[PDB]
Amino acid sequence: SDKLELLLDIPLKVTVELGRTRMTLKRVLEMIHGSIIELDKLTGEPVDILVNGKLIARGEVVVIDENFGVRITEIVSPKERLELL
Numbered sequence: 001s002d003k004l005e006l007l008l009d010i011p012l013k014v015t016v017e018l019g020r021t022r023m024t025l026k027r028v029l030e031m032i033h034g035s036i037i038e039l040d041k042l043t044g045e046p047v048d049i050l051v052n053g054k055l056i057a058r059g060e061v062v063v064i065d066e067n068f069g070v071r072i073t074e075i076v077s078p079k080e081r082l083e084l085l
Contacts, residue, residue: 016059016070017048046073054084 019039031037041047049057049070056076062069076084 012051014049014051015053016061016068017050052085056081056084 019041021037021039023037046058046060047070048055049059049072057072058074059070059072062071
């Protein structure tokens with residue numbers, strides 16, 4: 001297709017994230033330079049790789065020289081990949 005081109009083809013937005021947490025809005029307002037917030041992911045376990053807010057993989061952090069990288073260690077198959085968009 002001439003329009004499916006446009007798509008199988010757009011920059012998607014991949015986010016790799018450390019942890020999450022909830023937080024009373026009060027608490028969020030009190031935070032200063034230097035507060036230590038504690039996430040809920042354990043040191044040992046792999047980090048989340050979500051595309052368009054929807055989680056599709058998990059991996060370990062690497063460093064490609066200058067930048068953080070990620071080596072994928074578990075992925076969902078190319079179906080729910082699509083199904084999660």
